[PDB]
Ligand SMILES: CSc1ccc(COP(C)(=O)O)cc1Nc1nc(N2C[C@H]3CNC[C@H]3C2)cc(C(F)(F)F)c1C#N
């Protein structure tokens with residue numbers, strides 16, 4: 223149906239997870255509590271959360287034919303995630319990583335295997351019929367190509383009435399100067415704690431006041447700060463805050479940011495206020511932190 | 521599965537594990553996200569590695585080990601088949617995980633950090649072994665793990681051999697590679713007993729000669745005890761009391777020693793299974809494992 227789906231453009235990675243009691247010291251040999259294979263990656267994880275929340279969703283990302291992609295595709299389908307827009311690559315490998323999750327505190331150590339796999343381009347995005355989407359979320363990576371995709375969405379929206387415009391969100395998660403041009407695109411801009419700290423900011427309040435001038439007219443800038451909850455700032459100038467909802471036992475924080483992002487997107491897509499969406503994001507990601515994986519989030 | 525001729529195969533009973541190996545510039549701090557230089561998925565495990573070598577040496581061979589249905593087992597089974605290893609006797613498990621380890625190798629200093637597989641998968645039991653028709657095997661090699669259950673499997677092989685003529689008896693070998701006291705009862709079983717340098721050093725022995733003379737009294741009548749000592753070659757000792765030695769055949773450049781013990785073990789087993797002498801099998805074991813050390817993986821062992 224027209225204007226019914228939420229699209230997430232980004233990465234998909236096969237995470238081989240080991241759950242440990244204590245983080246291994248260098249040059250030591252420890253035994254894990256349990257092992258897992260999880261479909262991971264920023265946009266891919268957000269799609270999982272969106273499907274668990276009851277939102278019809280679709281993933282757009284690069285994958286290469288093979289047994290790693292075969293596992294990932296079957297998991298996307300198991301979670302009712304639309305994979306029709308996946309950019310299949312003739313050359314390269316589908317990403318895979320080693321994740322060490324500390325059971326005593328939820329810390330997640332990641333050894334990524336970045337592969338030759340080309341990024342999703344603006345020409346790949348050109349081929350996408352935008353009518354089926356109500357929201358499009360893009361994870362900042364190949365910034366110059368992504369700006370064209372965002373301009374395509376802006377152009378599409380100039381021909382639509384207010385109730386038919388596709389809402390857009392962007393995430394600047396890596397501290398790379400190429401990505402900072404993405405701040406000026408989208409209705410909602412998520413900027414990570416890592417990026418904020420690299421830019422010299424020491425709190426979510428400092429970052430939002432310091433970076434708001436970079437967002438486009440009327441946009442909302444969101445900054446999550448792990449156990450300190452999350453803050454948002456919109457055109458009225460009023461800083462909003464939500465305390466975190468930490469679990470009494472933190473066991474798995476892998477994908478907590480993606481859970482927060484998907485939950486804020488979901489709440490805003492349902493007509494909820496920015497203050498409510500901020501709270502809801504902390505509530506869902508807080509519950510995730512006390513669980514292995516994403517089952518049991520709602 | 522196809523017809524396997526009677527008394528043609530070499531069986532290795534033991535472990536199979538999926539080893540995810542990552543080469544890094546710097547060791548990752550806890551809760552950090554780093555990018556590795558290279559990643560590798562390798563089928564590992566002592567018995568599993570010996571099967572690979574046996575297939576490359578030209579021996580028909582089979583693996584017996586625990587696996588649980590799933591994606592990790594799917595990868596391992598496809599790798600066993602890639603190396604022509606018979607997996608018909610695998611003990612499939614209803615509960616547990618197929619073993620998998622994470623190895624982080626620091627490129628700047630050679631350090632290896634290992635997150636070892638969990639223990640949820642049950643080991644191959646004596647009741648699982650009872651159900652196996654032994655006629656297709658000429659040799660059975662057991663990797664010491666769940667010692668009390670393995671002793672029953674060894675007694676089953678002994679009983680089988682009491683009803684066979686000399687040319688139909690299945691030759692047996694055991695490996696004591698881990699320094700655990702439960703395993704030391706396995707010294708008294710098998711025609712050939714391999715004991716690792718690690719085990720020998722833990723028992724207070726400082727050379728392969730010290731270990732063989734020190735432990736020979738624990739082996740069964742007429743058995744051969746074998747001990748490899750990395751760059752110092754390898755020694756064997758049988759009932760004649762003569763300590764046999766072979767110098768190592770190191771490669772021009774050492775590249776990869778992972779599975780060198782398993783290569784030595786499979787090569788000694790192979791040579792003895794072909795009717796060669798203990799001295800000849802010892803030399804052959806050093807020659808094959810020496811060539812392996814100068815290669816990545818097992819391709820090119822010849
Ligand atoms: C407010 S919701 C939120 C939004 C974004 C992110 C960033 O996540 P990201 C992109 O690094 O995946 C995290 C969270 N939430 C949380 N993060 C926690 N930590 C993230 C650190 C990195 N790893 C472990 C560290 C601790 C801990 C908690 C707690 F309280 F449970 F202990 C919550 C909660 N609640």
Ligand SMILES: CSc1ccc(COP(C)(=O)O)cc1Nc1nc(N2C[C@H]3CNC[C@H]3C2)cc(C(F)(F)F)c1C#N
Pocket residue numbers: 716748749750751752753754768769770771774777778779780781782784805806809810813
């Ligand atoms: C005699 S053949 C043999 C049989 C068994 C094993 C044990 O294997 P294992 C349980 O470690 O899998 C190793 C070998 N051979 C060798 N091992 C080498 N090292 C393995 C050690 C582990 N610590 C560092 C050491 C380096 C080195 C060499 C050399 F000389 F080429 F450099 C040979 C040769 N030749």
